[PDB]
Amino acid sequence: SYTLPSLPYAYDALEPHFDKQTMEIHHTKHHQTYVNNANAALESLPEFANLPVEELITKLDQLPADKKTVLRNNAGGHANHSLFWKGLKKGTTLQGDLKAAIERDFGSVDNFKAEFEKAAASRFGSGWAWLVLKGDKLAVVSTANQDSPLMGEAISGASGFPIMGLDVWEHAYFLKFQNRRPDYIKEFWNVVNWDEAAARFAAKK
Amino acid sequence: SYTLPSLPYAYDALEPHFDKQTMEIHHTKHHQTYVNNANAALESLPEFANLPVEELITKLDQLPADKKTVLRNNAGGHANHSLFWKGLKKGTTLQGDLKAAIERDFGSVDNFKAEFEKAAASRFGSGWAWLVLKGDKLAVVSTANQDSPLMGEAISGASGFPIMGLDVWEHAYFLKFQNRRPDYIKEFWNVVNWDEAAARFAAKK
Ligand SMILES: [Mn+2]
Ligand SMILES: [Mn+2]
């Protein structure tokens, strides 16, 4: 069975950038609900129920017809939130190989930040903005709802290995930012975990 | 150009069902933003800017290619919220021709309610649930994001004239209900304005 993962930090660990109350609600309510609903849909599927969630979301076309949507949505939700928590941490710096690769692929760090900000702001409705590794090249993409680039292009409209991501569902920013998503996107730069991003970049897979 | 409409009531008129803080934010921030962003897109289109928003969204096919998305999203948002405010009121009773048509087309009011709740609950991500009239038959449909059944099947995946509807974007329920959308949907039955739904039905049946 999937479980709600413990966070790598206290709920207030991202203050003053991301608010404590939201972190707690977002974790214990929204993420928990994806875990529960994914588990319910997987009970009848022993051949899928016990795989890692990040594996399952590469396999959606393997499922029975009637399970594809519910697991896209809920295994997507579990995978994405699991990545998100580990992809946040204060006191990191974009540097080393990852910084150089970003400069290579976008021309500069500021070009990459602007492209990411634009993608995050222009995702209408619910979704996620991502930095992905697509073949040799880093890229900025967005997905709808709980879709992940790991699901591939035909399902998610994006592809590549996620390096990091920003949740732009309203629940992620309502309490502190209300409708001001650009303000929330700016605060993300203060809490994106560049150490984990670098680790993921190094691994490539 | 468009304006933020005045409401049929004070922000607290739907207590204790829908919270007054959300009513105020939802009107003055979210709806206002759709009005502003639609108006910005319409500035270069004086042939379209004069249309009632509910007519513009029936004509999205006619816009320039680079205008279609921004106005689908923002004119859809303005139309949908304008309907929503008029579509809420305490103290109404479903009755008369509209009740009878619901009993005809769904078998009973309770069957209808169960179908509406299911559509409202199963709209994954952002969107709306609707009671529509399609020519001569009532139906429950849902849409993504700020799409409306007035936009038609090709664009929105639904069609028909909206008799009433329920906003299921998270901003509409997060403060009071967090991720408990089913509890919010339950409270909608206490504030759906059956008098406005009946008037819209009388005009269109
Ligand atoms: Mn989230
Ligand atoms: Mn709304």
From Swiss-Prot, chains A, B:
The keyword Manganese applies. SUPFAM superfamilies: Fe,Mn superoxide dismutase (SOD), C-terminal domain, Fe,Mn superoxide dismutase (SOD), N-terminal domain. Its cofactor is Mn(2+). One of its GO terms (molecular function) is manganese ion binding. Signal peptide: none annotated. PROSITE patterns: SOD_MN. Keywords: Manganese, Metal-binding, Oxidoreductase. Its EC number is 1.15.1.1. It catalyses: 2 superoxide + 2 H(+) = H2O2 + O2. This is Superoxide dismutase [Mn]. The gene is sodA.
